[PDB]
Each structure stands twice: as structure tokens, then as C-alpha cells.
Amino acid sequence: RYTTAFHRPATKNAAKAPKYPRSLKANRNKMDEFSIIKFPLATETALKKIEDHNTL
RNA sequence: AAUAAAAUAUUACUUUGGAUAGUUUAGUUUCCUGGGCGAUGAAGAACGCAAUGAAUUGCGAUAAGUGAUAGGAACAAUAAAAUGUGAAUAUCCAAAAUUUGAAUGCUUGAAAGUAUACUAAGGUAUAUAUGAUAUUCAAUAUCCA
Numbered sequence: 001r002y003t004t005a006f007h008r009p010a011t012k013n014a015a016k017a018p019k020y021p022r023s024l025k026a027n028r029n030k031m032d033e034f035s036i037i038k039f040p041l042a043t044e045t046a047l048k049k050i051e052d053h054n055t056l
Numbered sequence: 057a058a059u060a061a062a063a064u065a066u067u068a069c070u071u072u073g074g075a076u077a078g079u080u081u082a083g084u085u086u087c088c089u090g091g092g093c094g095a096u097g098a099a100g101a102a103c104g105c106a107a108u109g110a111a112u113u114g115c116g117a118u119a120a121g122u123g124a125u126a127g128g129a130a131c132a133a134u135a136a137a138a139u140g141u142g143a144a145u146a147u148c149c150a151a152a153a154u155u156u157g158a159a160u161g162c163u164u165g166a167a168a169g170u171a172u173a174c175u176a177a178g179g180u181a182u183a184u185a186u187g188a189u190a191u192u193c194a195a196u197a198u199c200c201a
Contacts (some may be wrong), residue, residue, distance in 0.1 A: 011192040015173065022180055029178050030117060030154095 040046070040056060049055050 006194095009193055011194095014191080016181060018181080025179065026152095027175085027179070031178080035117075
């Protein structure tokens with residue numbers, strides 16, 4: 001057979017096929033554009049940047 | 057010999073101190089009933105959430121609270137809004153339940169992360185040992201054409 005090492009033979013490997021769902025959590029993303037952004041910073045430092053540097 | 061400034065003694069009032077008396081939403085002991093946690097993720101820890109909260113209490117991205125069922129007119133420190141078309145309040149119910157923790161894909165120091173499969177982002181499953189079933193294999197180990 002020209003080699004010495006004996007290894008574990010490769011057999012069939014089916015994928016996971018559960019008979020019932022593992023979770024019933026609602027498919028709702030709890031991180032959207034309304035939850036990511038809380039509110040703009042409204043301090044004098046933040047108001048200077050919006051004018052000159054064109055940044056919010 | 058003399059002085060009563062100091063010193064000493066008594067009482068009244070005031071002061072520093074918190075004894076004494078009155079009191080208890082706290083304890084101690086005994087007895088009765090139960091002794092009802094967790095991979096369907098427990099106990100513990102961490103972080104966050106109130107219009108004004110630092111702790112504490114209650115809660116989990118549906119946040120000092122949601123639905124439902126009872127309940128009958130309040131809360132209050134200050135404003136607001138809602139409210140008999142139902143406010144408080146109660147619950148072995150329903151939905152929901154962040155990061156961890158036996159902690160269980162891999163890693164974890166105070167570590168930020170990250171691989172594959174299924175249904176860009178999200179959500180599921182994948183630790184170790186183990187029982188039954190199914191399937192694929194290994195060894196001439198026993199026969200055997």
C-alpha cells in the first residue's frame with residue numbers, strides 16, 4: 001500500500017436534519033436605523049463641526 | 057498682718073453628652089404545612105432601563121413595565137399627558153426575557169474576536185461522556201466461493 005500510517009476511513013456524513021425547530025424566536029431585527037442612532041449631540045462643540053467641517 | 061484675682065463648696069439657669077423613662081414596621085425560640093431548581097439553560101455575577109435617580113427597589117432592548125383576567129377613581133416632590141370607552145392595585149396565566157455563568161463550536165486577562173452549515177444583517181445547530189434506531193465503513197477476527 002506504500003504507506004505505513006493507518007487513519008480513520010472516511011464514511012458518509014449527512015447534514016443535520018432536525019425533526020422540529022430548535023427555536024421559535026420571531027424573525028425581527030432588534031437593530032435597525034431607528035435603534036442604532038439615539039440622538040444628535042447638541043453641544044457648542046458639536047455645533048461648530050457641522051458648520052465648518054460639514055460633519056454631523 | 058491684709059487681698060479675694062485664682063482655688064474651693066452649695067443651689068438656680070444655660071451649655072457639651074446622650075444616660076434614664078415611654079415606644080416598636082426588628083429579632084430569638086418552638087410548633088404546623090410544604091420541602092415545588094437546571095441543557096425547555098438554574099443559583100451566582102455583570103451591564104442597562106424612570107420626565108427630572110446616586111444608592112436601593114422592580115424590570116430586560118416590549119426596560120420602576122406589555123397583554124389577559126379580577127379590580128373599581130387615583131398618584132403626587134414638581135410639572136405634563138392619560139383616565140368610568142376603565143387610574144391605581146393583584147397574579148402559580150400569555151408574550152418577552154441583554155453579556156456571562158454547569159456554559160456546551162473555538163478562544164477569553166481586564167479579550168477586542170472568530171470557523172462551518174441552514175434559514176448582506178439577524179436567528180438557529182455544532183463541547184465531553186452516553187442508550188436505542190438508521191446509514192456508511194474497518195479488520196481474513198471465524199467460516200467461506
